[model samples]
Target: AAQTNAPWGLARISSTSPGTSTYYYDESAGQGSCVYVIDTGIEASHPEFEGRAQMVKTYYYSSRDGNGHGTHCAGTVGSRTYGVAKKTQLFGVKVLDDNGSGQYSTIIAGMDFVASDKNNRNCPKGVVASLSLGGGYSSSVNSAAARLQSSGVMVAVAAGNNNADARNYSPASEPSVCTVGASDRYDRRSSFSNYGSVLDIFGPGTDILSTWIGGSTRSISGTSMATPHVAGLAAYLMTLGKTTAASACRYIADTANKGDLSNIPFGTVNLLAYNNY
Candidate 1:
């Protein structure tokens, strides 16, 4: 069987529709209504993302472009062609410079902005915050993320691309955050994906195709791409009445394809059960 470019393939054996169920149509039709991507700024004028992004706020901690890492991450989660959540609002927080690096303080500031900018009423309610970049879990970042979660914001953090245990990271290790792991198109855990008891769920990460800065598309491989798949699904789930962070996490972990579990450690996760809940 050949792979199709459609977001959700029609074949029953397709990875996107592992259950032989028509849930993909229901999920795709209810795609994200709103999302806030906390990453490098996107090419606002790009055809794939034009008019779709609502820059709630923009911050530049570094004067450089951060080597387009942020932009790449942003597209993976929300770009029109490759994104999992195509219709949602996107906000770019440029904590890192063009070199793809940033200070902890800057990242914290970006988180603060997402949690505090509600009084203006311009921002959407129940915004899901997606972060693809993180250092070993920091207490400060965890504290900020906890604060956001308490305030009704859903936070999704990457479990890092280092392929090491997540216990050493800040937000990913934080019990309050939804830590994500990576899997390939076939739903097997990627050899390089980090795994640990802290992992809340898994998503498509390896060889993920997404939009780039130069009006082109490219494939990215990492937990970074996995984070957005869940984030986008979270947004879509919200439309189905799964609004809270806890419920969203529950839905994702339960609905994931389980055929690839042979490689995943026991007590890891089973996403297929979520649909029934």
Candidate 2:
């Protein structure tokens, strides 16, 4: 049965086909989990969040998102209207600046804060970190991501928008993270998405509508948008007891629609992320 008026990306993951107007999902809806959006910043006051989104950490002077990237990603992860995990708490970890970019050390600092916060939670629920930003290769960045995973936080990263090998990127190339690539509604890979064996899965990224800055909504496309879907899925899985980083990663890959996508690069894993609803 049709469950909810879903966005294309949400509808796509709940089923195998491209055409679906509704989303079918487990009713629990990630009530016991939380997702950390590591990006520019999130306008937690956005009505779509239903008061569940907040800026928990930031390297910047203020917590406002001038770029709107982080707010959109957070909306995709757990907004009341557009999220993959409807009830998951959204925590903003501002690493990138209003320009949608950041220094590697600043990004690492955000990662570190998430790790520490997750560890210090009074009653720890499942934690998932969504990294919608990345640049070229950097061992320190990779190490920080790995440390977050080892600390029991599930990490999902974008495969990058370079249209080149994902292996050339840092967090995407890190084996410990779930690296997501972008796919369109027709089950075709996005031309701008980075590919290669390093990518762990693909998520619907084109024309994704979600909450933006200034208490509004808009549509944008990128691997940045794709990664949060996986993060949301991981949070949903955590509500189902797939709480650890390794377990969530394994389940996402195992339940994915195998080789169902076209235009995949030769060396890329052709798995489309699924909700297994």
Candidate 3:
């Protein structure tokens, strides 16, 4: 039987039997307090996000949604009900604009803005930031991420979609960020996911169904999608009283489903074994 609700497993696991409820399931139970997605604007009207989505802020480093990449990424991480962390609040920092690309300075400015707003009482306290976009490693970005981390914010970044033995790009390559790789329904590394010693964890990324601009749907693939699964899980963990980025990362790694590390150049990352204490 096909599992209609488990979007990540419909293509592989045919039992239809609900597998172990993932952190996403935790979100379904309203476990996460809040989160901030630092990406392009989210389609606030999308059905999945009707009651839960809000724009913390929107910046136009560019003009329009040239490719709609950032919007797609945003939906994956925090698009209301469609997202893994549906109950979590999302703040969109449109650093890349509509073209899916932005200058390093713009991203730095966005980071500063997020850090500055950390103390705001009306808004989510320090947010766990999700960065799906990236470029080559930049020391400036690294410093910015480190600053955010020091401010008590959890930062989750995509390890890039390129299949290689080296780190993908900036932000993800940044030491201060929780760099995530992609895995298929069976928990195997996707052929296109980048990997390296720096790769901190893996999440369900391949063939992910997420919200699109103008209230549409799309099946996309990338570490971009996977990054949010972990980010969402981290938010849930926080709600469970697990604070701190290190604790969150350790929890995810421990809870991950372990597999053969020898076949994959980056070895394996297990999240199912994550500990609460």
Candidate 4:
């Protein structure tokens, strides 16, 4: 996980993952972590996710992604060549639909599903849920994130694709969840990305190329493209024994951004952020 051996997709992060025998971050390749992609649906058979992904039909969709957004985000989380915790247990929580729409209750149900399965699944390290969709501030969604965090689940949510302050949104504005904004490859803020004190960090969301549905790859942009990066990194942090939500959050907030942000002083404490794993 040392910068000297960092992965191309995560070079913007000044923070590093855990290094071990075999590979740079072998120990932190989500060795014992389970990262849930609470999005459209993951094309679990996509070559990029072959062995690392577990596709599940949570609420609406039934193991299918008519649209490709969820698969792309899922790839960025743990695809062998394009992810953060490349080996993390990637599970698809289909909370959204082909039109990329869902109700607050649906989102909350997804959280509850993951939380319910955590113990039974025996994810030794912990679970991290990545949400790439957003609506307005739903206190119900916020409460679900808080409950998950209390149960030791890490939540990384998209700040919003609206290009406004993230404070106006739900999960993004939720204090318990890590709110991720969009940054380009140059570590510059994406012109369309939302920003605010409520946001936790940023990631390379512009033209991010990753696995797609129907066995393909494509480039995508938005805060949605940025959330999974944080979730993936959180998975690795948990693998390294930073199992609690508080511990992982501190590691990211304190060490991930080190001069990599364009809007460093976006707020009183400079909340502009990144997924450092």
Candidate 5:
């Protein structure tokens, strides 16, 4: 089941999957790149990571995964089963707690930990900061993401799950980050995806199956699900030698297949976002 579902939704948005890519699950597939999932936390023991998913930063602070959202998102970014950058090193930085709630300030602190000069230099090629959680708004976190962007860490954030405009949201509303919306398997926009001029791209989110806690995988949906696909795409871009955040973002957007989308306002931004690899 793991082998069969590993590249499920990925095949829809990418030209290569495990069998198609020269090295989808190989350690060096993302040789010098990393994707930091700053959310709840990862189960680290999951077989998908094959020991590559490093928990360098974690504050799952209390329980391993008060909730499995972070593990699932981290899987979409690097797990052998559902990852976009199949071999990219995965890191978890917990910001949310047991009830899927956070102190708010924790999210900001998690962001600072990875972007600090002490750690940024650790990544040889590049890094992608993936945030699948967000609330009403927070300017400080947005600015911190922007600051991270200026230093070369490509950031991918969800445009929120609310059925409203994205400009009024945090992280998504902030500049310098690749804000992702949700789309279904048929290449249509997710009914609940937030959209607007601020959206950088969209990806498969409906019934999306990815790695879950307890050493398993499950199906779920949300803009959060869609966010990691874009994050994985960003990591793939890094593997291609697109060293800077700006260069990767430009290529990802310019190559979008907007005609594949099927929702209002969103279709205007781009059809569907795809990775050339």
Candidate 6:
């Protein structure tokens, strides 16, 4: 069966063209993969989650999400309705606070939890993590993400919404993670999305409709939105045996729809992510 009238971001993938209204995916889409979201927090009870989303850990006072960023990103990653990988399990690792900002220590703590969770018997195998937040270059944060990748967790990060070079940002600039920029429904690079060589690929980001905090859905835009598409795709790829961080990125790049985007900035690669449906 095909998902009819699908969200443009979801439909934009799984097809070589931009205007397809259907999203075709496999029955086993990301069934056994686990994706960790490092953002504000997740609304695990959101109907779109189908009870598969959970707040496993939080550096904040509580797991309540005052900001909708995390849940939206999680929805894009694995929510049954709006996700790229519908059957993947989503685990939230809250790092940012209500206003969606955080310090290196707090962010690193979230990464540490995910890295350590690799050995946790309760956590499933075939792990992937999404970082939809970014800031100015922080060596500590970059190294922490690197450590997470080294621990065998496939990582994908937002190139950022800065509209400037992504190389100036923290984990986005980190070599170990798959850094994603944003594209619009027209298959053009979103004007606000950071670009340059740091971006491994692009994903549909503009006016993306996804699950919000109160069991509703909203349309938002950013490299934040694009990152999870790749994260979800990474999770889907992991189910096919691309379990390591390096292999996940390589498969994503190789399977990506190359040169399908327009308005690409100087120094940015032209690969737009494809779900290979």
Tens digits of lDDT, candidate 5, 108-217:
77778877732644567688888998777778878877887876788889898898888788888886788888987666678888998888788778888888998988
Task: Identify the superior model by TM-score, candidate 2 or candidate 3.
Answer: 2
Clashing pairs in 4: 201-273, 202-273, 202-274
Off by over 4 Å in 5: 1-7, 15-28, 117-121, 266-268
Per-residue lDDT tens digits for candidate 2, residues 1-277, read: 2556789999998998888868888877888788899999999998889888888888889989999999999999998778899889888888999999899999888898999997655324588999999999999999999999888888999999999998889888899889999998889899899999988899989889999988899999999999999999998888877546667887899899998899997888889888777
Tens digits of per-residue lDDT, candidate 6, 194-253, equal: 988878989989999999998899999999999999999888877766445558887888
Where in model 3 is the C-alpha error above 4 Å? Answer: 1-4, 9-24, 27-32, 61-66, 121-126, 166-168, 260-262, 266-277
Per-residue accuracy of model 3 over 1-277 as CA lDDT, tens digit each? 1123546522222122223333224323223455666777666556766556656565663433345565566566556534655566666667776666778998888888887775662433235778787788788887888787777778888888778743547887777678888877655677788887777787767788777877787888888877777676676566656555546776666555555222367253433222232
Tell me the tens digit of each residue's lDDT in model 4 across 1-277. 5424334445554333212112235445777788889988998888888677877656773768878999999988888767778778888888888888888999888888888777767588888889898889888888888787777788888888777887778888888778888877666677788888887767668777778888998887888888887788788777877546556666677756555557544471333334433
Which regions in candidate 4 have their CA more than 4 angstroms from the true location? Answer: 1-8, 14-27, 268-277
- Please write out the lDDT profile of model 1 over residues 1-277, one tens digit for every residue: 1324543212221344433322232434224355667776666656777577655565574422335555666675567665655566666666666666668887888888877774444433346788888887689988887787676667888888777888888678877778888876555677777778888887767776676667666777888877877776676566566556556776666665555543776656644212332
- The per-candidate count of clashes, in order, stands at 17, 0, 13, 3, 5, 0
Worst 10 residues of 5 by lDDT: 16-25
lDDT of 4: 0.75
Can you list the residue pairs that collide in candidate 5? 6-81, 257-272, 258-270, 258-271, 259-271
TM-score of each: 0.83, 0.97, 0.82, 0.88, 0.89, 0.97
lDDT of 6 at 71: 96
Query: Against the unseen true structure, what C-alpha lDDT does each candidate score?
Result: 0.64, 0.88, 0.64, 0.75, 0.75, 0.88
- lDDT for position 26 in model 1: 43
Give the range where candidate 6 is weakest over 10 consecutive residues by summed lDDT.
117-126
- Residue 136 of candidate 1: its Cα lDDT? 70
How many angstroms is residue 145 displaced in model 2 relative to the true structure, after the best TM-score fit?
0.5
